[PDB]
């Protein structure tokens, strides 16, 4: 049998973890103010 | 046929139920973003460039935010977050300069 050890948990975690630590960027189309 | 110069990026999309990532092809144009299936090589779902409200680019994962279109949020593992983010921004600028209100 194949057992995942320090690979899938790390790859998925970092993936998710990074989502919350990502900077958001808005487009000028929505914000039309000076 | 229309399609001479489409930017394709190799990204990994997580499946529902199984905590794993699968390689998928995503086509990004100057009009809209479409998702192509790596196995069938066909467009599954696509979103307009003007419909995107905001977007977040991480070193290993890209995040997308749609206004009144997608219920949730599209988040997957991207190999080139900076390249994709820059490409999207440029397309929006070109449209605004051509069609200004």
From Swiss-Prot, chain A:
Q: Where in the cell is it found?
A: Cell membrane; Cell projection, Lamellipodium membrane; Cell junction, Focal adhesion; Postsynaptic cell membrane
Q: What PTM annotation applies here?
A: Phosphorylated on tyrosine residues in response to thrombin-induced platelet aggregation. Probably involved in outside-in signaling.
Tissues with expression: Isoform beta-3A and isoform beta-3C are widely expressed. Isoform beta-3A is specifically expressed in osteoblast cells; isoform beta-3C is specifically expressed in prostate and testis.
Q: How does it assemble?
A: Heterodimer of an alpha and a beta subunit. Beta-3 (ITGB3) associates with either alpha-IIb (ITGA2B) or alpha-V (ITGAV). Isoform Beta-3C interacts with FLNB. Interacts with COMP. Interacts with PDIA6 following platelet stimulation. Interacts with SYK; upon activation by ITGB3 promotes platelet adhesion. Interacts with MYO10. Interacts with DAB2. Interacts with FERMT2. Interacts with EMP2; regulates the levels of the heterodimer ITGA5:ITGB3 integrin expression on the plasma membrane. Integrin ITGAV:ITGB3 interacts with FBLN5 (via N-terminus). ITGAV:ITGB3 interacts with CCN3. (Microbial infection) Integrin ITGAV:ITGB3 interacts with herpes virus 8/HHV-8 glycoprotein B.
Fill in the misc note.
The constitutive activation of ITGAV:ITGB3 on neoplastic cells may contribute to tumor growth and metastatic potential.
Job of this protein: Integrin alpha-V/beta-3 (ITGAV:ITGB3) is a receptor for cytotactin, fibronectin, laminin, matrix metalloproteinase-2, osteopontin, osteomodulin, prothrombin, thrombospondin, vitronectin and von Willebrand factor. Integrin alpha-IIb/beta-3 (ITGA2B:ITGB3) is a receptor for fibronectin, fibrinogen, plasminogen, prothrombin, thrombospondin and vitronectin. Integrins alpha-IIb/beta-3 and alpha-V/beta-3 recognize the sequence R-G-D in a wide array of ligands. Integrin alpha-IIb/beta-3 recognizes the sequence H-H-L-G-G-G-A-K-Q-A-G-D-V in fibrinogen gamma chain.
Name the disease: Glanzmann thrombasthenia 2: A form of Glanzmann thrombasthenia, a disorder characterized by failure of platelet aggregation, absent or diminished clot retraction, and mucocutaneous bleeding of mild-to-moderate severity. Glanzmann thrombasthenia has been classified into clinical types I and II. In type I, platelets show absence of glycoprotein IIb-IIIa complexes at their surface and lack fibrinogen and clot retraction capability.
Q: Which family does it belong to?
A: Belongs to the integrin beta chain family.
Q: What is this protein called?
A: Integrin beta-3
**Record gene name:** ITGB3
Swiss-Prot record, chain B:
The subunit field of the Swiss-Prot or TrEMBL record says: Interacts with PIP5K1C and NRAP. Binds with high affinity to vinculin VCL and with low affinity to integrins. Interacts with APBB1IP; this inhibits VCL binding. Interacts with F-actin. Interacts with LAYN. Interacts with THSD1.
Q: How is it modified after translation?
A: Phosphorylated.
Q: What does the entry note on its domains?
A: Consists of an N-terminal FERM domain linked via a short unstructured region to a large flexible C-terminal rod which contains 13 amphipathic helical bundles (R1-R13). The rod begins with a five-helix bundle (R1) followed by three four-helix bundles (R2-R4). These are followed by a series of eight five-helix bundles (R5-R7 and R9-R13) in which the N- and C-termini are positioned at opposite ends of the bundle, creating a linear chain. The four-helix bundle R8 does not disrupt the chain because it is inserted into a loop in the R7 five-helix bundle.
Specify the protein name. Talin-1
Looking at the record, which segments are called Interaction with LAYN? 5-101
According to the lineage, what is the superkingdom? Eukaryota
**Which species is listed as the source?**
Gallus gallus
- From the Swiss-Prot or TrEMBL record, state where the protein is found: Cell projection, Ruffle membrane; Cytoplasm, Cytoskeleton; Cell surface; Cell junction, Focal adhesion
Identify the taxonomic lineage of the organism of origin.
Answer: Eukaryota, Metazoa, Chordata, Craniata, Vertebrata
Report the protein's function: High molecular weight cytoskeletal protein concentrated at regions of cell-substratum contact and, in lymphocytes, at cell-cell contacts. Involved in connections of major cytoskeletal structures to the plasma membrane.
């Amino acid at each position: 049998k194949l057992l995942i050890t320090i690979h899938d948990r790390k790859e998925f975690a970092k993936f998710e973890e990074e989502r919350a630590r990502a900077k958001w960027v808005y487009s000028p189309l929505h914000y039309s103010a000076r | 046929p229309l399609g001479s110069g489409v930017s394709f990026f190799l990204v990994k999309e997580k499946m529902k139920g199984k905590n794993k990532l699968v390689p998928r092809l995503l086509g990004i144009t100057k009009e809209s973003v479409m998702r192509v299936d790596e196995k069938t090589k066909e467009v599954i779902q696509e979103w307009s460039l003007t419909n995107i409200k905001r977007w977040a680019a991480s070193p290993k994962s890209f995040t997308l935010d749609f206004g009144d279109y997608q219920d949730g949020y599209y988040s997957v593992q991207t190999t080139e977050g900076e390249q994709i983010a820059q490409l999207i921004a440029g397309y929006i600028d070109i449209i605004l300069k051509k069609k200004k209100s």
